[PDB]
Amino acid sequence: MTHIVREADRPGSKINKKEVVEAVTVLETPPMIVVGAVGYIETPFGLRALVN
């Protein structure tokens, strides 16, 4: 986590145009490789994985 400083953009609250501290979280996200696909049919008992 690291905490931004930003300036707020919201009409008439009392932090309108006045710069606020927020906390933020950092998420390391390196790319997804798509590696297959699944299909699903409707059944009267749920969803059902048909094909992979």
Binding site: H3, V5, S13, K14, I15, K18, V20, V21
Partner: protein
């Protein structure tokens, strides 16, 4: 009253019953928290006051026409650090409050110290009577 806008939840440093200082020149030398003027309450939870909170007071040291008698009062300083939206944690050297009317009009005429800035935008007549806001 005096509220326009929306005050943010600060840390409520003054419960029932704390003895803060009177900074008012009314001759009272104490306040004493009997209640807080918006507290709905929870079981075992004491009502507590922070900056800009109107509360119900008595006077424990002071003039005898002010002692032994319930009065309203607004808190202008506190020792519990409290966050502002600018990320500032700000605290004071003394808890203090001023004896006030029912309609936010200040009773006396001068304030001996600084008034916190979250107090002074709710109560104009405490802003009008202080040297240094914040």
């Amino acid at each position: 009253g005096g509220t326009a806008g929306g005050k943010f939840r600060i840390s409520l440093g003054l419960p029932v019953g704390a003895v803060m200082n009177c900074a008012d020149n009314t001759g009272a030398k104490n306040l004493y928290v009997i209640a807080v003027h918006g507290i709905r309450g929870r079981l075992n939870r004491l009502p507590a006051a922070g900056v800009g909170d109107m509360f119900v007071a008595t006077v424990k040291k002071g003039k005898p026409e002010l002692r032994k008698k319930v009065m309203p009062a607004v808190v202008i300083r506190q020792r519990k650090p409290f966050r502002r939206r600018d990320g500032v944690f700000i605290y004071f050297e003394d808890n203090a409050g001023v004896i006030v009317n029912n309609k936010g009009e200040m009773k006396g005429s001068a304030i001996t110290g600084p008034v916190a800035k979250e107090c002074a935008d709710l109560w104009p007549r405490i802003a009008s009577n202080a040297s240094s806001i914040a």
